């Protein structure tokens, strides 16, 4: 049964190492969510600092890839950082060669093609991560593109990733079935973050403090992460209505 150890086909036409890499994805037990506003793309993720000895400022699964692109990872941190460093390198090389900022969807495709190579070539293992790329693209507008260990990728109106992804996904599905639009019709990113947090609270059934969340916001020409105090301001506004 060596067809389960390396990336070759089983008799069923399956790649078991790819399937087991998907399972490694949920090892962190963290749920992420991404949504699009009019002018922005918001990504939120659970933050869990179990150890009191940890420096909580260094515990993050959101990465600033370029000025315009942000990336949240669902999976173990070593593979997350492997993927982060490569995406940063690819985004920089792209700008140098072709004279404009790498689009979110093109980076997602590039990382997905690299992921595909690990499913075809035996000596390389798949990375046990799902990469969610976010930006406000200068051509396509607010953008969410997600990559997995199979080398699959696709654009999203909104998305969710993690152990409880199905609960979050159905919650978001139901909202967009009502509104009948591909985005959160809201002017300020602050209110789009409030939406994202609110709908995660409803979906997961848990309350959040400022230290339980981690937020990334993409606007035109920059992606940035919110501090604990910026999130606290968000949580106060949610509670007050």
């Amino acid at each position: 049964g060596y067809d389960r150890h390396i990336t070759i086909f089983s008799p069923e036409g399956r790649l078991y190492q790819v399937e087991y890499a998907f399972k490694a994805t949920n090892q962190t037990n963290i749920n992420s969510l991404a949504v699009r506003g009019k002018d922005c793309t918001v990504v939120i993720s659970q933050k869990k600092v179990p150890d009191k000895l940890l420096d909580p400022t260094t515990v993050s699964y959101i990465f600033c890839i370029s000025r315009t692109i942000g990336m949240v990872v669902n999976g173990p941190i070593p593979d997350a950082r492997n993927a982060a460093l490569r995406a940063k390198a690819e985004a920089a090389e792209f700008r140098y060669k072709y004279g404009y900022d790498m689009p979110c969807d093109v980076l997602a495709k590039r990382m997905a093609n690299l992921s595909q190579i690990y499913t075809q070539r035996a000596y390389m293992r798949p990375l046990g991560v799902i990469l969610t790329f976010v930006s406000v693209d200068e051509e396509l507008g607010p953008s969410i593109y997600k990559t997995d260990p199979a080398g699959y990728y696709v654009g999203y109106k909104a998305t969710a990733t993690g152990p409880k992804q199905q609960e979050i996904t159905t919650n978001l599905e139901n909202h967009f079935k009502k509104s009948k639009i591909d985005h959160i019709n809201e002017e300020s990113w602050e209110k789009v973050v409030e939406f994202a947090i609110t709908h995660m609270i409803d979906a997961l059934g848990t309350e959040f403090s400022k230290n339980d969340l981690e937020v990334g916001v993409a606007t035109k020409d920059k992606f940035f992460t919110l501090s604990a105090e910026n999130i606290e301001e968000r949580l106060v506004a949610i509670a007050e209505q």
Binding site: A21, K23, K52, L53, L54, T58, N82, Y123
Partner: protein, 243 residues
């Protein structure tokens, strides 16, 4: 089964058993700790005196990287040396190109990526060490701990090796009882105590204490070994606390 025979193979769980087996080599090793203080970091390690024939103060375990970073590790000692040798190459090329000495978070990722690379192929073995390291850069003090998987985080206190549970419990008290922070000279004393308390797990053989520190006020942000009177003051403080 057979998923644990080769490095870089995912089990049906989504685990790399060879990396988990490397952790067992780390758990088997001697105790080492790190303490983040007000303007720096303190490193300490348990050195088991296998025999009277060992020359005292000679078999130095703590290693310096560049001039501002200290590294200590538990597990397979040669693997730790190999990792520090790499760290030194990374710190040299960083300084060569960018002039400034490597920042600690930047340095942490250099080790992190290298250790992680040794979980990607069956042609290499994972590292059999957990490494505690840190120092002072332009943004202040930083303490890190790096595992065989390539995983690392920033720490207030860190501990690894055979006496890690004992040490971790002691570090957690210091964090609770000193929210405003700990001074560099205090951290040296506390580091000595914690290694002495953690020695109950390796209590058969007697041991030798080794401490180092980087502090902005006490060492000008450079890594130095604790020697002579300051080392003996810490040993006395530690010996008083166990009795």
């Amino acid at each position: 089964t057979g998923y644990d025979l080769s490095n870089s193979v995912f089990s049906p769980d989504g685990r790399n058993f060879q990396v988990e087996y490397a952790v067992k080599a780390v758990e088997n090793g001697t105790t080492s700790i790190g303490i983040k203080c007000n303007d720096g970091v303190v490193f300490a390690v348990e050195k088991l005196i296998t025999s009277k024939l060992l020359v005292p103060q000679k078999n130095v375990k703590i290693q310096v990287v560049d001039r501002h970073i200290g590294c200590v590790y538990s597990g397979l000692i040669p693997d730790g040396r190999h990792l520090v040798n790499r760290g030194r190459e990374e710190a040299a090329s960083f300084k060569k190109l960018y002039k400034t000495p490597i920042p600690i978070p930047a340095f942490a990722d250099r080790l992190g990526q290298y250790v992680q690379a040794h979980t990607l192929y069956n042609s290499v073995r994972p590292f059999g060490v957990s490494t505690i390291f840190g120092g002072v850069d332009k943004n202040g003090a930083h303490l890190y701990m790096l595992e065989p998987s390539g995983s690392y985080w920033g720490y207030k206190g860190a501990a690894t090796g055979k006496g890690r549970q004992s040490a971790k419990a002691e570090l957690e008290k210091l964090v609770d009882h000193h929210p405003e922070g700990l001074s560099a000279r205090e951290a040296v004393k506390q580091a000595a105590k914690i290694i002495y308390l953690a020695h109950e797990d390796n209590k058969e053989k007697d041991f030798e204490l080794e401490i180092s520190w980087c502090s902005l006020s006490e060492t000008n942000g450079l890594h130095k070994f604790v020697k002579g009177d300051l080392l003996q003051e810490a040993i006395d403080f530690a010996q008083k606390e166990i009795n």
